[PDB]
């Protein structure tokens, strides 16, 4: 039990799939000239 919980706190081989992150900062678009379901979720006034 002690070992299995430590594996849960510290999953060594379980987590890392490929280690291939792009590492670029994602940019959010705030423009209100295009109508989309995702934009309507974040933009309220219409």
């Amino acid at each position: 039990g002690i070992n299995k919980v430590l594996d849960h706190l510290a999953p060594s081989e379980l987590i890392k799939p490929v280690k291939s992150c792009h590492n670029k900062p994602s940019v959010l678009v705030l423009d209100d000239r295009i109508v989309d379901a995702a934009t309507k979720d974040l933009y309220v006034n219409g």
Binding site: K16, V18, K19, S20
Partner: protein, 78 residues
Amino acid sequence: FVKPYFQERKHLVNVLLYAMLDLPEEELKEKINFNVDMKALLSLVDTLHDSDIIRHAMLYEHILNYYIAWVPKSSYIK
């Protein structure tokens, strides 16, 4: 310890560089007035020419295998 004795002898530079370039005996005999042993010349030539003297899983293993696997008057000693 040995170099001053080499500088003592005078023809050493000529014969050695000629040994370096493997010059034919005919050119040697043209301007050198002392006999040079041919079988020595071939032997030194032979000694001179002696020349017996997946991509992401490997990074995790090699970073462990290369950085965790602890390996336990100028240089002039080339």
